[PDB]
Each structure stands twice: as C-alpha cells, then as structure tokens.
Amino acid sequence: ATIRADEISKIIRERIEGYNREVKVVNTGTVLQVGDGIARIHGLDEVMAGELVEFEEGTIGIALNLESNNVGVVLMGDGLMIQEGSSVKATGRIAQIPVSEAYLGRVINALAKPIDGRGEITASESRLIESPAPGIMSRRSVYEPLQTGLIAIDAMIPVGRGQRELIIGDRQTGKTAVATDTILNQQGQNVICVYVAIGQKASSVAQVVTNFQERGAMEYTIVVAETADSPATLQYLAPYTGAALAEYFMYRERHTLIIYDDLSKQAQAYRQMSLLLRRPPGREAYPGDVFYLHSRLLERAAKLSSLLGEGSMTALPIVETQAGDVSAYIPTNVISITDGQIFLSADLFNAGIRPAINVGISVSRVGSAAQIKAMKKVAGKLKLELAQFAELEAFAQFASDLDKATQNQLARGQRLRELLKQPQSAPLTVEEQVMTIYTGTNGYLDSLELDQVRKYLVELRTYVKTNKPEFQEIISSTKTFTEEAEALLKEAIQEQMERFLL
Amino acid sequence: MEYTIVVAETADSPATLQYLAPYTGAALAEYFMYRERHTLIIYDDLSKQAQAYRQMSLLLRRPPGREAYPGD
Amino acid sequence: MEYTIVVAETADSPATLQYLAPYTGAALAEYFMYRERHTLIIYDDLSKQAQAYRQMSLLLRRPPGREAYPGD
Amino acid sequence: ASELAARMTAMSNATDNANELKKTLSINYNRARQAKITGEILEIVAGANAC
Amino acid sequence: EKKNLGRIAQIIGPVLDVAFPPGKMPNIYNALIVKGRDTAGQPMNVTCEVQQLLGNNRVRAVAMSATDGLTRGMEVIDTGAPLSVPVGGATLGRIFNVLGEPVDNLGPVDTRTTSPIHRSAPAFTQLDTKLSIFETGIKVVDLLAPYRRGGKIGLFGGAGVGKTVLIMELINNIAKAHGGVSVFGGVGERTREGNDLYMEMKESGVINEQNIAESKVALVYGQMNEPPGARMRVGLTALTMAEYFRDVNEQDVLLFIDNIFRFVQAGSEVSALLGRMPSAVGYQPTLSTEMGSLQERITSTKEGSITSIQAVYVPADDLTDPAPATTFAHLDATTVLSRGLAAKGIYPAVDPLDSTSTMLQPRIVGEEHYEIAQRVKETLQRYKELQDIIAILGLDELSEEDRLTVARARKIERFLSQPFFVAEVFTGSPGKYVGLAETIRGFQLILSGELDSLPEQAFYLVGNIDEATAKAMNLEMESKL
Amino acid sequence: GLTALTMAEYFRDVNEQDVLLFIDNIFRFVQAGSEVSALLGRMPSAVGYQPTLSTEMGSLQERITSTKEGSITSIQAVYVPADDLTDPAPATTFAHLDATTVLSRGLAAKGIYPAVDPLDSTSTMLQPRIVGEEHYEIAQRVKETLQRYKELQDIIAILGLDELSEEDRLTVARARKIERFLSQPFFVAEVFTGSPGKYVGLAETIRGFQLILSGELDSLPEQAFYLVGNIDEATAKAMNLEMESKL
Amino acid sequence: GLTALTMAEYFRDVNEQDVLLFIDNIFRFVQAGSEVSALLGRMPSAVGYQPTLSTEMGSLQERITSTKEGSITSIQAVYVPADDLTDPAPATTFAHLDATTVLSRGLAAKGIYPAVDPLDSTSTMLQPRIVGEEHYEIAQRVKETLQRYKELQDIIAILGLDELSEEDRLTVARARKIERFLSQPFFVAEVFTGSPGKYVGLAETIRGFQLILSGELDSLPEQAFYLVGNIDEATAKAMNLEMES
Numbered sequence A: 001a002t003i004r005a006d007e008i009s010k011i012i013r014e015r016i017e018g019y020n021r022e023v024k025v026v027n028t029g030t031v032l033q034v035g036d037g038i039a040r041i042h043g044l045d046e047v048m049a050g051e052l053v054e055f056e057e058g059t060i061g062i063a064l065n066l067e068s069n070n071v072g073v074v075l076m077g078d079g080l081m082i083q084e085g086s087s088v089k090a091t092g093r094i095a096q097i098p099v100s101e102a103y104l105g106r107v108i109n110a111l112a113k114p115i116d117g118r119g120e121i122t123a124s125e126s127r128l129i130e131s132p133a134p135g136i137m138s139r140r141s142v143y144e145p146l147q148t149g150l151i152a153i154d155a156m157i158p159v160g161r162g163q164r165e166l167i168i169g170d171r172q173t174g175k176t177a178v179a180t181d182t183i184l185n186q187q188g189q190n191v192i193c194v195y196v197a198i199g200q201k202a203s204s205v206a207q208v209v210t211n212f213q214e215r216g217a218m219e220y221t222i223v224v225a226e227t228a229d230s231p232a233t234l235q236y237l238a239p240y241t242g243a244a245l246a247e248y249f250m251y252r253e254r255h256t257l258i259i260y261d262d263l264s265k266q267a268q269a270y271r272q273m274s275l276l277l278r279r280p281p282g283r284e285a286y287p288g289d290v291f292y293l294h295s296r297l298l299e300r301a302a303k304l305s306s307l308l309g310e311g312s313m314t315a316l317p318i319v320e321t322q323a324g325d326v327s328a329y330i331p332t333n334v335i336s337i338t339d340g341q342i343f344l345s346a347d348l349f350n351a352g353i354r355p356a357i358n359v360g361i362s363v364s365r366v367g368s369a370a371q372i373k374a375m376k377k378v379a380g381k382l383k384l385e386l387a388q389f390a391e392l393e394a395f396a397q398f399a400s401d402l403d404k405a406t407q408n409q410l411a412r413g414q415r416l417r418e419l420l421k422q423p424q425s426a427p428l429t430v431e432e433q434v435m436t437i438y439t440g441t442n443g444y445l446d447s448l449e450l451d452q453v454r455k456y457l458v459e460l461r462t463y464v465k466t467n468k469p470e471f472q473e474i475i476s477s478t479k480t481f482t483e484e485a486e487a488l489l490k491e492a493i494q495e496q497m498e499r500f501l502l
Numbered sequence B, C: 001m002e003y004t005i006v007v008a009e010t011a012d013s014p015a016t017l018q019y020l021a022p023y024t025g026a027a028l029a030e031y032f033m034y035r036e037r038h039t040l041i042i043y044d045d046l047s048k049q050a051q052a053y054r055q056m057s058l059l060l061r062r063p064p065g066r067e068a069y070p071g072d
Numbered sequence D: 001a002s003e004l005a006a007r008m009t010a011m012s013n014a015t016d017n018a019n020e021l022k023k024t025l026s027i028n029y030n031r032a033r034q035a036k037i038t039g040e041i042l043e044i045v046a047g048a049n050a051c
Numbered sequence E: 001e002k003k004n005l006g007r008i009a010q011i012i013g014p015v016l017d018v019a020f021p022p023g024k025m026p027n028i029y030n031a032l033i034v035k036g037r038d039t040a041g042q043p044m045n046v047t048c049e050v051q052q053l054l055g056n057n058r059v060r061a062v063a064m065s066a067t068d069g070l071t072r073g074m075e076v077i078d079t080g081a082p083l084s085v086p087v088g089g090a091t092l093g094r095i096f097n098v099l100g101e102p103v104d105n106l107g108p109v110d111t112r113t114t115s116p117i118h119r120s121a122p123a124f125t126q127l128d129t130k131l132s133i134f135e136t137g138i139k140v141v142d143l144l145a146p147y148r149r150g151g152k153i154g155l156f157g158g159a160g161v162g163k164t165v166l167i168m169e170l171i172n173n174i175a176k177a178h179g180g181v182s183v184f185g186g187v188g189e190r191t192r193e194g195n196d197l198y199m200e201m202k203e204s205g206v207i208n209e210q211n212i213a214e215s216k217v218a219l220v221y222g223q224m225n226e227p228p229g230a231r232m233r234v235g236l237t238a239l240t241m242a243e244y245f246r247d248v249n250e251q252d253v254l255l256f257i258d259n260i261f262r263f264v265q266a267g268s269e270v271s272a273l274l275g276r277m278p279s280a281v282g283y284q285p286t287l288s289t290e291m292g293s294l295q296e297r298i299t300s301t302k303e304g305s306i307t308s309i310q311a312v313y314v315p316a317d318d319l320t321d322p323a324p325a326t327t328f329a330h331l332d333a334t335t336v337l338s339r340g341l342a343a344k345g346i347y348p349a350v351d352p353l354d355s356t357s358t359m360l361q362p363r364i365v366g367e368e369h370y371e372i373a374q375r376v377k378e379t380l381q382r383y384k385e386l387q388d389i390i391a392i393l394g395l396d397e398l399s400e401e402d403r404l405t406v407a408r409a410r411k412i413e414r415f416l417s418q419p420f421f422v423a424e425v426f427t428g429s430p431g432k433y434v435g436l437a438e439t440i441r442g443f444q445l446i447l448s449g450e451l452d453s454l455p456e457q458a459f460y461l462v463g464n465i466d467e468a469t470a471k472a473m474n475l476e477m478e479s480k481l
Numbered sequence F: 001g002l003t004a005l006t007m008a009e010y011f012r013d014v015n016e017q018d019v020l021l022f023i024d025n026i027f028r029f030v031q032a033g034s035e036v037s038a039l040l041g042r043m044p045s046a047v048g049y050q051p052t053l054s055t056e057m058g059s060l061q062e063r064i065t066s067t068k069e070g071s072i073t074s075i076q077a078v079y080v081p082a083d084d085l086t087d088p089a090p091a092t093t094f095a096h097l098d099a100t101t102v103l104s105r106g107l108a109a110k111g112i113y114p115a116v117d118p119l120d121s122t123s124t125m126l127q128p129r130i131v132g133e134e135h136y137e138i139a140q141r142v143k144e145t146l147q148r149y150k151e152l153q154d155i156i157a158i159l160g161l162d163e164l165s166e167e168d169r170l171t172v173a174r175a176r177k178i179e180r181f182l183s184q185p186f187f188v189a190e191v192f193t194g195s196p197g198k199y200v201g202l203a204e205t206i207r208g209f210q211l212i213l214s215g216e217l218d219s220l221p222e223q224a225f226y227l228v229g230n231i232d233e234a235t236a237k238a239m240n241l242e243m244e245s246k247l
Numbered sequence G: 001g002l003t004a005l006t007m008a009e010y011f012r013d014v015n016e017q018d019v020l021l022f023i024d025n026i027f028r029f030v031q032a033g034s035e036v037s038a039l040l041g042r043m044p045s046a047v048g049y050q051p052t053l054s055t056e057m058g059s060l061q062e063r064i065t066s067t068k069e070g071s072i073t074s075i076q077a078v079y080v081p082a083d084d085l086t087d088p089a090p091a092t093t094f095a096h097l098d099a100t101t102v103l104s105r106g107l108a109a110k111g112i113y114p115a116v117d118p119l120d121s122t123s124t125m126l127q128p129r130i131v132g133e134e135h136y137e138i139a140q141r142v143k144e145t146l147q148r149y150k151e152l153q154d155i156i157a158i159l160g161l162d163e164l165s166e167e168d169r170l171t172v173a174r175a176r177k178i179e180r181f182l183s184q185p186f187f188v189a190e191v192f193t194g195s196p197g198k199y200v201g202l203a204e205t206i207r208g209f210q211l212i213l214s215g216e217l218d219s220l221p222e223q224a225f226y227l228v229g230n231i232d233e234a235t236a237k238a239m240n241l242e243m244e245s
C-alpha cells in the first residue's frame, strides 16, 4: 500500500529514533485510524491472532486480521470516544468470554456484560468465541424430543434436542412469539434457554423479556439481547456469545435450547462490517463469508455423545425473508446450513391461522425419530389427514364431485386446520397436545361447529386431566400411547362431550 | 422568440457546459424573477445533465453510487 | 480421423493454455488455408476461452468490465 | 344462461389466477431488479479501484 | 470546546477532509464549524460533522451547507460535542434547519439549554413494558389500526390525499386531549411543500403567529437544497428536539418524520460521497444500523412516550428492497391514505381495509376491541367484494341477509369519516374528538344491528354515535318540510 | 469513425457537395472506447462503457450537420447491445439521431423483413407540413392500427382470437395486412429471400396503404401481402395463391 | 475435495479398484475458494468467486477420470446458490459433469420426491449405442410428454385446465401420471415419511413407462402413481385406493 496505516508521522518517528536498536515494543500500542469500527493498532507483536485487546475508554476488541505492522482489530463497543493516539493493551486471552451458572435470568449485552442494570455477574471465563465445533465422533443422532408446545410444530415438523431447525417466516408474522412459546413451554423439563436477539427493536426485546419475567421462564432463560441501535460488530458477535454461553451448559451435561432472533440481521451486520472494510461482496452484496459465518454459529449446536456427557443444543434460528422469497441468498444459505425448516407463511397468518406453520413446505429432517414413542403413530395419521385436506383444498373438489367431500374428508381436514391454531403464548403439554391431535385425526369429533373446535377443546383440556389423572400419568411415565390410555381418554372425552351437550 | 433565452448546449460542447447549462438558465431566470417578472425555465434532458455530471465526476475520480451516477 | 486435427485442452490446464488453444487451432488451420485446402476449424466452448482469459486478466489485475470479464 | 354462467366462472377463476400470477410476477420482477442493480453496482465499484 | 484549528485539506464536492494537529482530534460525529469566507465578503461559517476518521490526523467530515467557496487551509474549529441543537420550550413554533438556526427569520431561539444530536439509546430498564394503545382521536385509526405509543407509524399515502390535514389534526388533538406537544421533523422536505405546511399550520391554529412558546409544533425543515449530510441529520435533529420534550417534561411527543426513504436516500448519498463500498440495491452498507439509530430512540421511556409518525415511500412499490424492508422491520402500525377515498370525500382518507397494525391483537387492545375491529374489517371486505355485484344485481335483488351487510358497510364507511379540529378553516364544521371507548361503542351499535334504520348520510362527518343519532333525528324533523 | 467523418467533412467544407456517409455499427465506436478507457485509468461508468460515452459519441455525431456549404446525410447502423434499448450506447445516440429506425428481433422471428418496427421507428420528419398531409394521415393511421394490434397481442395470445369484438377483429386483420405489406424484397437481400427485389416509391406505398386500411380489400389472404413490392403485385399474388390453392 | 480425491485415486491407480467418491457439496469447495481468494488479495471475479473458479475446480474434476487401470464414478452433489442455474459456480461444473441431474425445488414444493426435474436432468449416456433403442426411445417419448406439458403450463396459467382441446388434455393427463410416477420412496427416506424403500430396476421401470405412455392405464387416478415403485405396485395401490375409497 502506498498509503500504509503504519505511516503516521508520530508512528514512523518511533521507528526512526532507533533503526536496529533496543528491543521493540512488547504490548503497548497507540491506536490509529480508528474509523469504521476497525481500529488499526501499531505494535502489539505479542498479540495472538484473535486476541482480546482492550482500549483506553474500555471498549473491547477482537484482533482478527493483523498485518505486518498494524494489528487491525475489530472493536466491539462503538469506536466513538476512541481518539487517535490513545494507548491500548492486549489482555493475553484468545477471544474469551466470562460465563457461569449465574447468567440464568440475566439480560446480557453480547459482551458478557449485563444490561438489565441489577448487579454484575461473576464467573470462571473458560469459554471461547471461536470454539472448536463438536467433532464427528462426538455427535449422536437426535432422539430426545423437545416439547416446542405448538401442535403443528411438534406434530408434523418435530424438533429434537440437538437438531437445529430454523424458523423462516416473513416480516411481522410470528417467529418471535412463536420462539417465545417454545422457550416458555420448557418450564418443567430442565433446559437452559438462550434467547439471543440479534436485531430487534429494543421495545420488542423489552416486551419479550417481561413476558418471560411474569410467566416464569426467567428461572432458566438467558436473553443475550442486542438492540437495532448497536454497532454492526456487536450485532455480528451477539450470536457467538450466545452460542458460547449456551455451550458452557451444553458441555457440562445439561440440555439447552438456544434461539437466535433475526439471524438474517446478523448476516446484515456482517455485510455492514465487511463492506466498511471494502472486502469484495458477492450475491446481494453479502461478502460471501456469510455461509462460513452461519456455519461456525449454527454447527456448534448439536447433541453430544455419552463420551463427553449427554449434552444437547437445538439452535432454532430465525431468518426473516424480508424479500418475501425463500430463494434469497441468506435464507437459502441458512436453509443449507440448518437441519430443516419451519416455514411461517405470511398469507396464512394474515388469513388467521395464528401459528402460521404451513405443513407442506415446513419439513424436519430428523423426522419421527425425534418424536416421543407415543405420538409417532397418531401424528402419522394426522399427517395423512393433512395431506388429504391439502389436496382437497388446493385442487379439484370445488364443484361438488364424483368424490363429494365436506361429507367425508374435507370437513375433518378443516377441523384439523382450525384445530392447529393456538392462543397467544399458551403452551400445550405433551399429553394435552397428544389428545388434541388424536381427537381430530381418528374421527372422535367431525360434525362439530368448525369455527369453535378450539373453544370446545379448551373445556376438554380443562376437564380431562382433572377427571382422569391416569392419562397424564400414562403419558408422563411410560411416554407411550398405550391402548388402555386410548380407552380411558375415550371415557373422558365421552364425559366431556356430555357436559358440552349440557 | 422575443422573450425566450434558449440556452443551447450542443453535443460536442464539453462535459462541463452540459453540466452547467441548467444553472446558467437558472441564473438568468432568477434575475428575471427577482425583478418581479414571472418566468418559466424549461430544462431539457436532466438525464443528459446528470450524464454529463457522471462524466466529469468519474473523470475526476469521485466515488460512484447507484447506476454509476456520482455521490451528489 | 485422417484429416482432422484435434487441438484439445483439458479443464486442468493453466488458463493460458485454454486461452491459446483456439489460437493454436486457428494458426494450424490457417497453415492449410494458405496451403489452399478448404479447412474447417470448430471451436468448442468458446465461452471457456474467454473465461480463462478472464481468469488471467483478473489474475494480472487488469481492470475488468461487464460480467467481470476484462476489457478486450 | 348456463353457457353465460360457465363463461362467467371461467373468467372469474381466470381473473383470480391472473391476480395470483401478477403477484408472483411482481415478486420475481422485484428480485430480478434488485439482483440486476446490485450486480451493476458491484461491477462499477470493483472496476473503479482496479489496483 | 477548544481552538482546534486545522486546515481543510481535501474538499471533494460536499465532503471536506480536514486535518488536525496531532495533539487533539474530534472524534466521530463531533461537530466542527469552519470559519469560512463567502464570495460576497462576509465570514459565513458552514458547519460540519466528522463522519469518518482517515488516520493521519485527517477526519473526513461532511458539510451541512454548500462547500462552494472553501479554500484549503481555512480555520476549522472543533466544538468537542455533537451538533448542539437548541432544545427547550423555546423551540416550540419556529422553523429550523439542521444546525439549529431559525430560518423563518422571526427571531433567535434561547440556546440556554441544548442537547447533542447523537445521544445514545435508552436502556432496557428504561424501556416500558406495557404495549399501550395511543389514542389519536381519529375514529379510523383508533378502531381499525391503532397506533402504539412509543412505537412507530407509517403513513403510506402520498401528498394530495389529505396527509397534511391528517397530521395537523393529529398535532392539534395531541395538544388538546393529551398533555404533550408534537415535533414535525420534515427530512428532505421540498421547500414549496414546506411553506405549504407552515402556512397551513399558521392558518389552522396549530402554531400561533402572534403567540410562540404557546404553540404545539417544533418545525425542523431540512430542505433538499442542503447537502446530503444535512437532510440526513435533520431526522436526528428533530429526534433530539423531541427527546428533550420527552425526558424533561414527561409528556407524549409526536415526531412527524417525513418520508423515511429520503433519510435513507441521504444516507446513501453521504456514503457514496465517503466512498464506503455500496451495499445491496444502492443504499449505504450501514443502512440497518443508521436507520435503526434513527428509529430506536423512538421508545416509550418511563418518563414519557415519544411515539413517532413516519411517512414511508417505497421506491418502485416493493416491500422487498432493503430500505422499505429495514423500515417495515421497525414500523408498528401501517396506515395508508387512499387517493380514491380522498377524491370521494371520506376525510380522513385513511384506507380502512389495507391499513394494519401489530397492536390490533386482542391481548393489546381488548377482546371486545379486537372482535369489533375484525368484524368491521370483514364487513368492509364484504363490501369491497360486493361493489362488483351491486352494479349488476342492484341493492334489492341480492339476498337480504347481506343487504344488511351492505347497509351497515355504507354506515361504517361513512361513520369512519370524522370532521377535524383543522378542517374548520376550510368548511366550517366545528370538529369532534372521538375517544376510543366512544368509537368502540358506536361501531358495536352500528354493526350489531340496532341502527339499521338511520339514513346513510347521517353517519357522514359526525363524531360520537349519539351525535349521529342527533343528526338523523334532525333529518327526521326536517323530513316533513 | 473519425476518419470517415474527416473525409465527409472535407467533402462538405471544400468540395461543396452533399455527401452520404454510411457508418456501420457506430456502437463499435463506443465499445472500443470502452476497451481502451478501462486500461487508460478512467473509472468505469454504467453497465460497462467508458465514462465519456456521451461526449465522445457527440464528438462523432455533431460533426455530421448540413452546414450551408452542403449536406452530410448520414445513416449510422447503431447496434443495440442484445436489444437493450435502454443501454447507454443507444440511449446517447437516440438524442443525436433525427430519423431513428428501431429494427426489432420480435418482428424478424416471424419472418417479416425488413425487421423495422412500425411503432418504435419514428422520425421528426413525420410532421404534416413537412411530409405531406395525406402521407402524414396514412402514417398516423398505420401506426395507430399497429399499436392497437400490439395492445391486443395479450388478448389474442391467451383468450383466443375470437374473444374480442368484430370491429376490433377487422382492426386485427387490417393490422396483420399492414405489418405484412410493409415487407420488402431488397435487391441485396435476394440471396436470403430467393425471390427478386422490387423497388417501390413513396406515393405507391401510400396508395397501397390507403386501399389496405380503408377496408376496400380486406378479402385477400394474409400471405398475399407478404414480401411484395406494390399493392398491384399483392393483388396479382392473391390470384396466384387462389389458383395454387385448388391446383 | 483434493484430499478425498487423492485418497480415491490411490485406490484407482495402485490397487485397480472401481472406487466411488461421493464428494458432497462441490459448491462448498468453490465458495471456500471464494473466501480464501477474497482474503488472498486475488482480484475479485464474477459475482463473488475467485478469478480461478474454472481452474481450481478443474483441478478437482479433471483428476476424477477413469483410467485404463480402474474407473471412478464420483457423485458430486454440487449446489446451485439461490436456486438459479446461471450462476458461475455450478455453471463451470455443468461443463465438467456428464450425467447432470438438476434437483429443481419445484417438484419438491409440489411434494414429488425426488425432485429431479425431468427436463433439466440430462446425460451424455442417453445415446442409442449405450442404452439400446428401446430405453432411448422411451426416454425420448417421456421427455416429449413432459416438455409439451411444461410449454403449455403457460396456458394452465391464467386460463383453466378445461380450455385445452382433447389433444392437450390427454397429454396433460399423461404428463401428470408421469411426473407423479417419477417419485419414489427411497430406501433412506424411511426416516422422514413414507413407505420402506423400493429398489426399481431399469428393465423394470421401462415396463412402467411403456405402459403409461401406451395409454393402457388411463383408468388410474393421479394419487395412485404417487410415491410407488413398479407399475404393478402402482396398479395395486390404485386398487387399494378404490377399496379404501
């Protein structure tokens, strides 16, 4: 470079006082050209590639790309108050983050710094940002079910502990209350959630964190939250600290559930962080590195084998198809890096199905291996009925027919589709959604008033467990849908149909 | 044609004049306006004016935005 | 086969050989064109020649143009 | 009247399907326009420096 | 702050790279005025802010006024802080440019108190929890597409549709019903429309030409004459001028930031000027970050709400491209003003069907409000459908189970039209403020089936529903004569 | 191109004679400028051409003017890059070119040669006081009929030829007759057509179009107006085709 | 890619075996090249890739050649980015491959797995000498039916299916039967959903396609051929569909 960053007059004065003289500068460097969030520091020859260099004000920086003279760092906090000529010092640690079992409940600001304002957290650091992703021998296939809570998701597109599963919707249609529902249903079973909001308006993450507060998920969840008013480097590293913080609990034999929010926004902040560097972009001006970015991030969320202890981390990232096209660069990229998609269609949510899940497109590659041994057969029957309804509504059977549906199958498919809709943030237990699935698929109730199947089944769920606690026991202990359970739930729903008749 | 200043910029006229012509007519009509007379300045091919500005800027090595049209 | 030269360059040739394959063919056919035999050169993937020329010219850091193809 | 109602329902499903096709074509046209413009801009900026 | 004299080394168009002595340097966004000399012979000083540092003590700064006439070597003076905006009760009525000097020539503004433009975000503990409905005073907005206090609002409709009378109604109703004041924040406002709006204000009692500091608007006009660094920072100027109101008087503030696409356009202009490599379709790379820094300080802090109302102009009419995408990622209520409805005369022209809000959900509004709003939207859907068929069949031939639907649909479409406290200068109607409860009960009575006998033109341009019954009873009195 | 311009400018400045320069592919005068401007150090413009595309193109085109010593009539065969009719290289030359003539691949794929577009090809010599009143009226009626056909191309292609009116069907058949009648056997395009060429004057084509679009001869088959010199030759080809049909 | 390819070529050149290398996501190799050459200072190229995007992947592909000692049948799951085939990173792989089968997302959005698009899927082995005139002729006939269907899809657009005459109606019924039949429950897709896998042979599927194109199977509905194996099993599925009504 003709204009090299190591050509400030003061800087070359430091080298010109002694050419081949007394031993060089070890750890003290004056920041120069502290511009687009990327401070070029002179000196610091002891910096490990990836060091955690501190500044004068107190703004931490990663030393990613360090050239022959200038150790160009990526300062995390906004490089506003940093003036040229300030002295910096490396810390001697490689992208390390303080993490402990005391973060459960806090609201971290993507640098292991609390932003709730109630106290500071202590830890043993012990975790890295650029961690070695779990190897090939260490991952054991996903079998442990993860009770997302939503009927549609955990019935046809199941998620298992350790199987990443993105939530690819559109703008302003689900995925946030939907991911919050999946976190919220995790109250009884032990998980250490990490709801890491990459780009969200501060009011939205305030609403979500207060929802967690009043509904009790704060006993385990960890909102590593980064507002939309944050330098793109912090929105870039927010899911990395989220993932390292969840991995501190994944490696210690404890199931976790991390949820990135707007993983498209991390790619957008990386697009900013790179086009400020003027590194050459690719499709849609993404710097091409977004696949490696979402590989390091999403690939460190999988179930570990019994060698390293039975740990697990579903990743549930949330890409937003702002373009309205799933075949855009970052949505298809995260679909290629993830193990399955849960598409939240915009048109169905505008239509009224409140979990906007469409069943045809949204697939889960882990499949029925994830579901409980109870739900496999009944959800297979429900998926059969949903295929039937999908064809009957998408294609012919508009004129009455040779087939003549709405008498045999269209009514039942409509009952299923109007049954899949949930309330707002009202999670359903495993046995309850088992019975909700069973009622519609095997024809226990078909001729009801189709508008109010939910309005019936709220009374059904209220009555059945208080009438027959045997069902909750057979589903909670055996985890298998035995036929004696079918008989007793038949009796319970008979009595419920009676009390609904009167 | 008694009352019409046709500021004319031919093609082989350099880039700066095809850039400056709207401003020249504007400086004439602004005088005629500030002296109480209603005027009517009719430019021709502002796309061609911006093309001449594109010329002179990209020659002057100013960073280009969309459609390679310059910053401002 | 007794009358057909095949100037063949594989994919794993360095991009100069792919760029010079059609020129070698054109010169070897033009020898017969000056020897008054009505030859017939057939290129194959002439897109690959310009692609390898693009690879060279971008590896030479000469400025590119449309579709990142170099100037000439 | 039956033929006219059949022509009416043909034109009706044709109008609904043409509306769906216009929406899909507008989406594809916007993604094509953005791809074309961003490719143009990357061409221009990358040819600007030419180190 | 200091006599940080530097030389304006490079002046490329609007961008002027200034050098500084190696001791003291203004950090990013730290405003600096240059002691310039105009061609006329007066020492006019064009103000700048450091958009970028270039290392060798040369901070690349963009200018808030024309750089025509800035020799290199001119004394540039650092202020040590971002652009000081003369906030306070004083800046209530006058017009402002970006640097904070009144251009309406009325007089000087009290700079006793001033806040910097680039104050950072509020905090997580300072944000408020409850998703609180913002009672505007328009029956359409309050029923169908409520506005979030502390949220964002999009007025998709262009000019000529009645946007100016709508925003004037909103400001006057904020000053009347609520306790707060509004701040029109016109960013890149075409000066003809700027003076149009200012005169509409001064003739509509929104700001008093005889009484300033009693008025209800803090006009911030960044005219498109000004360089790209100016009409970009006009949004943030209006934002801090409203944030002082919020965090000093604890009152509900309204930001009428004019069409955000001009702010994003100015960001693209200034980034292409700084040479930072452009992003997707051609807006700046720091598009999400910049527009989020503009629209994240719109948050209901525990002190008071600062809810904004931001026009949005989609280029080539697509929600797909990044600027409308990154904007609609932030908006919390989108209400379009419809040109055909405006030409009809159903003022306000806000379209009842295509307008939507994320607040409309029942847990936010109220179960009865969600039910009546969804039923009104379904009724207006039915009428938009049957507008095709009432031409062919007529109002009588079609079935009389949905003839009631069409009748109540005409009644709703008329009842949504509300006379304004601003339209008094044009037509002479007094103007009625309609609370949320009143319009809820009115729409419940209209759609439930009681008022199936009142005439259709009795609901047109009326306030509360009992006033509509009064209009109908007066028409009944005059029916005999 | 500048060499041709220098010869023509000499013959217009000194020899006092009106000269007719044909430049073929004036788009090369811009593309070669692109290939040199890339290396020269000048920054790239839009889609890939030189920055001074417009000033260079003007430096060629402006020197072609009737200058009181003669008249340099000129016919530049501008090349539209892949029929990008919005590209900079034709977009800058449309401003300089008086009687532009946009030839279309769309009206060549169906074999109507020359492939000149009836609509897009427009000239500022189609003003009535300059070109003749009846000629102007016939040109307006032909262009309007072709515009109506281009607007009915969507209805015809999808909903069938029958689903439109029976006066508009007459306008469609008349537009077909016109857009086939404005085909020409060139003398130099006989090797492509196989048929001899017919040079037809202006008044003869006006008298042909008058009878074609006046509805007086809407009975002839469409192929009887294809690749035909004059309307009388079209009438003769109708007889030839009606005899060949039964024979 | 290079190290797995060396591991395979050592077996093909020293031990003389017919080894296979199922190189997965060739595009990830090219995109890794894109990253390294965006950081290696090498000047940028078409849309984002390295300038040597046709010589580096040439060093990948051209080392996979069947030598006179042993042969290697690599199956490279090259990935088109953003689902467009005009992209250079798969466009430079199209020229190297010889039996390219484009898994277009259309047939998977319709639920037809595998979504191998029959028009785009093409091979240099669809020749008379290789497969015999029988299988070649049936391949030509099925590609004919599917191409006619795809070209009148522009009419199965805005208008309805009815507007076709009897010719287009019959060819659409046959094309729907075919594009449904081209689905198959995999032996490894027992996990996701469906039947245990069915291994379908060449001389067996040729019978099914001869039967469908011969017109002797107009009686069967569309959801009978979907996700079935051989044609006898397709008729069995239709019969059981009629019994279950």
Ligand SMILES: Nc1ncnc2c1ncn2[C@@H]1O[C@H](COP(=O)(O)OP(=O)(O)OP(=O)(O)O)[C@@H](O)[C@H]1O
Residues within 6 Å of the ligand: A170, A171, A172, A173, A174, A175, A176, A177, A178, A200, A204, A320, A354, A355, A422, A423, A424, A425, E329, E358, E359, E361
């Ligand atoms: N199942 C549901 N039923 C009813 N309303 C819902 C449901 N889920 C979400 N909402 C509504 O959606 C709003 C939250 O937005 P949503 O989660 O739909 O999209 P989002 O992810 O916030 O959008 P973005 O991706 O832009 O952040 C809430 O105000 C809530 O009222």
